[PDB]
Amino acid sequence: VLSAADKGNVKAAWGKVGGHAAEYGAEALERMFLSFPTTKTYFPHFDLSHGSAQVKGHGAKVAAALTKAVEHLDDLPGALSELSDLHAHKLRVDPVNFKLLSHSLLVTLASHLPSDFTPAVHASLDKFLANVSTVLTSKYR
Amino acid sequence: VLSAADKGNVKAAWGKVGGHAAEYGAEALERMFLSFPTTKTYFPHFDLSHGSAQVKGHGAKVAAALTKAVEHLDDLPGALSELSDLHAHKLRVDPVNFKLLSHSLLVTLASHLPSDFTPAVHASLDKFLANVSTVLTSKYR
Amino acid sequence: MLTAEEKAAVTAFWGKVKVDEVGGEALGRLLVVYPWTQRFFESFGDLSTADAVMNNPKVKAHGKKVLDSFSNGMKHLDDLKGTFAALSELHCDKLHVDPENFKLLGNVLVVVLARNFGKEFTPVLQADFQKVVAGVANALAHRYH
Amino acid sequence: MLTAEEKAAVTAFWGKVKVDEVGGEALGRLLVVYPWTQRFFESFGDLSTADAVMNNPKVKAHGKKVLDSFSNGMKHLDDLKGTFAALSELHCDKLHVDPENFKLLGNVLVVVLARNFGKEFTPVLQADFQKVVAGVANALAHRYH
Ligand code: HEM
Ligand code: HEM
Ligand code: HEM
Ligand code: HEM
């Protein structure tokens, strides 16, 4: 679904993210949990306080999966195969939650990359996260 | 994406629609307009009264597009190419409205095929319509 | 919400129809068509296939209750907010149900009414029911606002 | 709406918001990121590219109005309903804007606050703003209920 221009925008933006991917993943989760506290209920045995090593560790894993997606924009369903089973079929995550995390990631990226986060780049990243979200919610069946 | 099972369910259900496709497309539009008055503002050039020739003629066109899609379940994006540009670029249809028409089509099909509209078939058709909707909203440009 | 005419229409229809299996069919369909909703009903037992869901006795029993609640709403259309205030707290604060799902269930119920009730469930009557289910969903979501 | 101390926190931060940039940027971003919203602004001139939208004086000017409206609700956090009355009838009864788009604009404004304020727009502060924009959206949508 991403256009050529979208794919370029996403790759360049993720490029600027650089070695800060895990840090931003952790910030996005933190923002999601604080702004939308119901999301915490998917992580019942986590300590989700600010600076929790579990939020930091989980942030890193979410960021890595996003990096894998960025490297595989032509086949998101295949790149995200295992994760889609995990979130849709195993964990039954309500599709709303992906919107909440996607928005939390846009917030985090706009904060840290204000000179790269143009309207055009915001729209491409929005589409990319919606596309990742579609894949991750495709195996409820 | 549609599983092979879903595509079987969709083709079989549309087979049951038989010669009633155009009639059901018209009824689904009427149910959409009546239930969700806000959708009427996309057709200010229509007489929207019950039984109007314009709604009847539009119903047939909607139905024929769905029939085309049913015949092209392995490649929806390809099949619905021109309609996607039209709905997204020209008509600027708010994505919410696709869910309203899709729900309207499910009410219509349920009403007329109450023996064929099993929970599995319902779930297949719902996916089919969401997918069609995804496609018709897949390039605001 | 509803005009007097719309209330009378809804009320007359609801008076005549035999609805004792409708709730269970609506709940069953929700869990089949939108399977994330299964998360909320782990205690209900076998939900592993469409058939298992639809024939699950707990789903059927709980659905009857849900419809009983909907019928309560139908008797107090003037006060949906008051009617569902407690249930809103339970569903949002304790059960953590995203309010979009209240809309999904109202719409599944309409689909079910249409499947069960044929030509009497006209576009005009269905639109009246859409107002009722939108009202119930807004009233349930209330503790979110 | 918010706690008294949450209100204090939001009030303090809002003071820093530049009254004539942020609104134009949020409105502009809404039209670029969610292009169907352009249907509502046919009189506004060229909206055909991202640069055209963002540099369109009518967008900037209208965005200022939107922001001044947010600024207004920021002073009436415990009664958003009445504050957004005239606007709720404009947007719902006259313009027929689907209420989903209220949530979207609220969320764009929060992204815009983040881009412009960076590390100062902390998770906790942003959480307060999420409550505020949800309040505004709910207030604006009231005429649909
Ligand atoms: C961009 C969207 C998302 C991505 C890329 C993503 C990625 C991941 C990854 C890589 C894992 C670890 C999988 C493993 O251990 O093998 C994971 C686990 C998990 N995810 Fe997500 N996720 C996303 C959205 C969400 C959302 C929205 C929720 C719910 C609010 C969620 C809930 C969970 C939970 C509960 C786990 C397991 C945590 C545990 O170990 O107990 N995820 N996700
Ligand atoms: C399943 C989803 C839909 C399908 C398959 C569909 C199909 C079609 C078709 C075949 C046409 C005629 C194109 C032509 O002239 O050849 C059309 C036009 C149009 N559609 Fe849709 N449509 C869908 C959803 C929607 C929705 C949700 C809306 C908004 C409420 C909408 C608004 C319109 C409008 C305003 C036109 C121009 C009609 C005219 O002037 O005659 N469509 N669509
Ligand atoms: C029209 C909308 C709804 C109405 C009127 C409604 C009504 C009710 C009622 C009356 C009960 C209590 C039944 C009893 O006494 O045992 C209940 C419980 C429950 N509801 Fe709903 N509900 C609605 C929507 C939803 C939705 C959409 C979900 C989740 C997807 C949900 C999840 C639950 C759960 C998990 C319980 C507790 C079941 C248990 O005891 O294990 N409800 N609801
Ligand atoms: C969510 C928060 C929103 C706020 C606070 C807001 C605020 C305003 C304000 C202050 C006005 C000026 C009205 C007057 O002078 O009487 C206005 C007008 C308008 N708004 Fe919004 N609005 C919001 C959402 C939206 C959205 C999401 C859309 C479209 C997608 C929209 C479309 C319009 C339109 C089309 C006008 C009339 C513009 C014109 O032609 O002059 N509004 N709004």
Looking at residue B87, what DSSP letter applies? I
Kindly give, in sequence order, each residue whose CB lies less than 8 Å from that of residue A22, ignoring residues fewer than 6 positions away: A56, A59, A60, A63, A64
Say if CB C35 and CB A92 are below 8 A apart.
yes
> In whole angstroms, how far apart are CA C17 and each of C67, C120, C121?
13, 10, 11
d(CA B80, CA B135): 7
Q: Which amino acid is at D2?
A: L
Rounded to the nearest angstrom, the minimum Cα separation between D6 and chain B is: 33
Residue D29 CB partners (closer than 8 Å, separation 6+) = A119, A122, D108, D111, D112
Q: Give yes or no for residue A132 CB within 6 A of ligand 1.
A: yes
User: What 3-state DSSP class applies to A5?
Assistant: helix
Return the residue whose CA atom lies nearest to atom 42 of ligand 4: D91
Dmax (CA) of chain C: 44
DSSP string, B39-81: GGGG-TTS--STT-HHHHHHHHHHHHHHHHHHTTTT-HHHHTH
Measure CB to CB from residue B1 to each of A1, A3, A138 and give the nearest one: A138
Cα Rg of chain D (Å, integer): 15
Rounded distance between C-alpha atoms, residue C123 and residue B17, angstroms: 19
The residues, any chain, with a CB within 8 Å of residue D9's CB and separated by 6 or more, are D124, D125, D128
The reply to whether ligand 3 has any atom less than 6 angstroms from the CB of C136 is yes
Of A1, A77, A141, the CB nearest to B138: A1
Q: Which of A92, A96, A97 sits opposite C35 (nearest CB)?
A: A92
- In 3-state terms, what secondary structure has residue D17? coil
From C104, C86, C84, C83, select the one nearest C40 (Cα to Cα). Answer: C104
The answer to whether the Cα torsion of A99, A100, A103, A104 is positive or negative is negative
Distance CA D103, CA D137 (A): 6
Structure tokens at A48: 């989700």
- Length of chain A, in residues: 141
Separation of alpha carbons D90 and D98, rounded Å: 12
CA distance C140 to C91: 8
Alpha-helical (H) ranges within A2-138 are: 4-17, 21-35, 53-71, 76-79, 81-84, 96-112, 119-136
Question: What are φ and ψ of residue C27, in 5° steps?
Answer: -60, -45
Q: Using an 8 Å Cβ cutoff, are A85 and A44 in contact?
A: no
Question: In angstroms, what is the span from residue B71 Cα to ligand 2's centroid?
Answer: 19
Which structure tokens are listed for D142? 């009231």
Q: Where are the domains of chain B?
A: 1-141
Say if CB C110 and CB B107 are below 8 A apart. Answer: yes
Find out whether C28 and C60 touch, Cβ atoms under 8 Å.
yes
Cβ contacts of B125 within 8 Å, gap of 6 or more? B9, B10, B13, B105, B106, B109
**CA-based nearest residue in chain A for residue C98:** A96
Give the C-alpha separation, D13 to D8, whole Å: 9
Task: Flag whether residue A38 sits within 8 Å of chain C, measured between CB atoms.
Answer: yes
User: What CA–CA distance (Å, rounded) separates D60 from A65?
Assistant: 38
Residue from B1, B75, B76, B141 whose CB has the most chain A CBs within 10 Å, to mutate: B1
Does A113 contact ligand 1 (Cβ within 6 A)? no
A98 in Cβ contact with A137 (< 8 Å): yes
| CA nearest neighbour of B132 among B90, B43, B55, B72 | B72
Question: Cβ(C43) to ligand 3 under 6 A?
Answer: yes
Torsion of CA C125, C127, C129, C134, to 10 degrees: -170
CA distance linking residue C37 with residue A88, whole number of Å:
11
The tokens of A107 are what? 């917030």
**Calpha distance A65→A21 (Å, rounded):** 10
Coil, helix or strand at residue C126: helix
**Cα D111 from Cα D118, distance rounded (Å):** 10
* Most distant pair of Cα atoms in chain A: their distance: 42
Chain B hits for D35, Cβ within 8 Å: 88, 92, 140-141
Between helix B4-17 and helix B53-70 the angle, nearest 10°, is 140
Contact of C17 with C9, CB cutoff 8 Å: no
Distance CA B109, CA B17 (A): 8
**Chains in contact with B via at least 3 Cβ–Cβ pairs below 8 Å:** A, C, D
Query: What are phi and psi for residue C103, nearest 5 degrees?
Result: -65, -45
Per-residue tokens: D27: 């409105």
The angle at the Cα of B36, spanning B30 to B42, to the nearest 5 degrees, equals: 75
Residue C34 to residue C16: CA distance in whole angstroms: 30
d(CA C66, CA D9): 42
Strand, coil or helix: what is B11? helix
Ligand closest in space to the Cα of C59: 3
* Domains of chain D, earliest start first: 1-145 (1.10.490.10)
CA A97 vs. chain centroid, Å, equals 11
Which residue from C111, C119, C127 is facing B106, i.e. has the nearest CB? C111
The answer on whether D62 is annotated among ligand-binding residues is yes
Distance in angstroms between the alpha carbons of the first and the last residue of chain A: 22
Round the CA-based radius of gyration of chain A to a whole number and report it.
14
A94 near C39, Cβ under 8 Å? yes
- Within 8 A of D135 by CB-CB distance, chain C residues are 145
Q: Report the top-level CATH class of B1-141.
A: mainly alpha
* Single-letter amino acid code for the residue at C52: A
C19: which 2 tokens? 């609805």
Backbone φ and ψ of B73, nearest 5°? -70, -20
The string of DSSP codes covering D74-134 is TT-TT-HHHHTHHHHIIIIIIT---THHHHHHHHHHHHHHHHHHGGGS-HHHHHHHHHHHH
Q: How many helices (H) and strands (E) does chain D have?
A: 8, 0
Binding-site residue numbers of C for heme b are 62, 91
Report the distance separating Cα D122 and Cα D139, nearest Å.
25
Nearest in space to D14 (alpha carbons), one of D116, D141, D84: D116
Nearest to C145 by CA among A7, A72, D103: D103
Single-letter code of the amino acid located at A91? L
DSSP label at C120? G
User: What is the spatial distance between Cα C6 and Cα B34, in angstroms, rounded to a whole number?
Assistant: 13
Cβ–Cβ under 8 Å, residues C76 and C83: yes
- To test the contact with chain C by mutation, choose from A41, A91, A92 the residue with the greatest count of C C-beta atoms within 10 A, namely A92
Closest CA to C99 of C66, C145, C63, C132: C145
Interface check A114 vs D, CB under 8 A: yes
Residues of chain A with Cβ-Cβ distance to C103 below 8 Å are: none
Asked if C102 contacts C140 with a C-beta cutoff of 8 angstroms, the reply is yes
Q: Per the structure block, which two tokens stand in for D30?
A: 């809404």
- Ligand 1 contacts CB of residue A63 (under 6 A): no
- Technique used by the depositors: X-ray
Task: Tell which B residues from 2 to 21 touch A, by Cβ distance under 8 Å.
Answer: 3
Q: Is B35 near chain D, with CB under 8 Å?
A: no
Give the span between the Cα atoms of C83 and C79, in whole angstroms: 6
**B93 close to C (CB below 8 A):** no
H-helix or E-strand containing B89?
none
Q: Which amino acid is at C143?
A: R
Neighbours of chain A (3+ CB pairs under 8 A): B, C, D
